[PDB]
C-alpha cells in the first residue's frame, strides 16, 4: 500500500455508466461515470495558513460522493485503476 500526502486522498472508482441503483431505473445510453467511491487510504492532513496537521474529515474505507475535475488524476496502482484527489473534491459521505 501507499500513502498520499497532505490533503490528498486516493480513491477507487465505483462502477461506471451504470445508473442501476435508485428508483426502478434501468440502464441508459448517455453516460455519467462514477459519482461515488470507496476510497483506499488517506493523507495526514492539510496545512492552513499555518494550520500544520489538520486531520481530514474523511476516514478510510468510507463510501463518498464527489465531483470529478482535473484535481483528480487517473492512476493505475497494483493493476487497479485509481483516482487521486484533494479532500476538497469529496462532497458527501454516504452511509448505509
Interface residue with another protein, options 21, 26, 48, 96 (CB under 8 A):
26
44-73 residues in contact with a copy of itself (CB under 8 A) are: 44, 47-51, 54, 57-58, 64-65, 67, 73
Q: Which three cell numbers, joined as nine digits, stand for 31?
A: 453516460
30-69 residues in contact with another protein (CB under 8 A) are: 30
Give the binding-site size for another protein (rule: CB under 8 A): 8
84 Cβ contact list (under 8 Å, min separation 6) = 4, 8, 9, 10, 11, 72, 73, 75
| H or E element at residue 60 | none
Q: Where along the sequence are the contacts to another protein (CB under 8 A)?
A: 23-30
Amino acid at each position: 500500500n501507499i500513502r498520499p500526502l497532505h490533503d490528498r486522498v486516493i480513491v477507487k472508482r465505483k462502477e461506471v455508466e451504470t445508473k442501476s441503483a435508485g428508483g426502478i431505473v434501468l440502464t441508459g445510453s448517455a453516460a455519467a461515470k462514477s459519482t461515488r467511491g470507496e476510497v483506499l487510504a488517506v493523507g495526514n492532513g492539510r496545512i492552513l495558513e499555518n494550520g500544520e496537521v489538520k486531520p481530514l474529515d474523511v476516514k478510510v474505507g468510507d463510501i463518498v460522493i464527489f465531483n470529478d475535475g482535473y484535481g483528480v488524476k487517473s492512476e493505475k496502482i497494483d493493476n487497479e485503476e485509481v483516482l487521486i484527489m484533494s479532500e476538497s473534491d469529496i462532497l458527501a459521505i454516504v452511509e448505509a
